[PDB]
Every structure is written in C-alpha cells, then in structure tokens.
Ligand binder design. Structure first.
Ligand SMILES: [Cl-]
Ligand SMILES: [Cl-]
Ligand SMILES: [Cl-]
Length: 130
C-alpha cells in the first residue's frame, strides 16, 4: 500500500516511533518519504553488492532481514524480508527500531543524510494531529 502522509504519521505514532532513540516523527516521515514514497511493497535490487532494499523504509537484506539470496548476509531483525512488504507496517517499524539501536542511529540510511539531516522537516507532520 501507498500511505497518505498524515495517515502514516498517525500510524507511526501509534507504533511508538515518536522520539524513539531520540528520533522525532518528522524524521521518520522524511525517511519514509525519500526511501519509498510511503510505499510498503517497494523493492530495489542493488546490483553492486547483490543485496535488496525492502518496503517503506527500504531496509537492506545484507544486515537486517533474510532473503536467502544475499551473500554473507545476516538478519538482525530476525525476519524474512517478506515481512517488510506487508501493508501492515508493525514488523517494518520493529526492524527500523532495531536499526537505530545501533551506533549510527538514523544515519544508517544515506537518504536520510541527503534529504533530511540538518533540514527543516516540520512539513512532513503538519496538520496530521501528531
Ligand atoms: Cl530533529
Ligand atoms: Cl517473517
Ligand atoms: Cl498486510
């Protein structure tokens, strides 16, 4: 599914993302926006290293979820990458929380550094009731 902006904001807030390990909701929104356009079913193959990115946060198979087909990979979220292609984003959120328990936090995603870091991200949550 492709979430509408404010629907997603409220969905993430219910799942406990607001301020998780210091990360505001508007940061998570900015991440989802630029990773996937708020689209849960997106996959992107990285020909360079044979990994794939999955779902609304484009979480990578080398470190985070198992797809069977990524050489040398691990699965720190202990999920099938299939779980990151559901319309229900609970598993994706749990996995995103796992990512940001590591030292880099939200910097783990380059798109966040590119499109969100050091910017005014207030617009992502404007009017959403969060
Ligand atoms: Cl901030
Ligand atoms: Cl699973
Ligand atoms: Cl689903």
């Amino acid at each position: 599914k492709v979430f509408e902006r404010c629907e997603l904001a409220r969905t993430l807030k219910r799942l406990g993302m607001d301020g998780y390990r210091g990360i505001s909701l508007a940061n998570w929104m900015c991440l989802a926006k630029w990773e996937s356009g708020y689209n849960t079913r997106a996959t992107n193959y990285n020909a360079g290293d044979r990994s794939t990115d999955y779902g609304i946060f484009q979480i990578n198979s080398r470190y985070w979820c198992n797809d069977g087909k990524t050489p040398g990979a691990v699965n720190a979220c202990h999920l099938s990458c299939s779980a990151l292609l559901q319309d229900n984003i609970a598993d994706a959120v749990a996995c995103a929380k796992r990512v940001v328990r590591d030292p880099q936090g939200i910097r783990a995603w380059v798109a966040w550094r590119n499109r969100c870091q050091n910017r005014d991200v207030r617009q992502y949550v404007q009017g959403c009731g969060v």
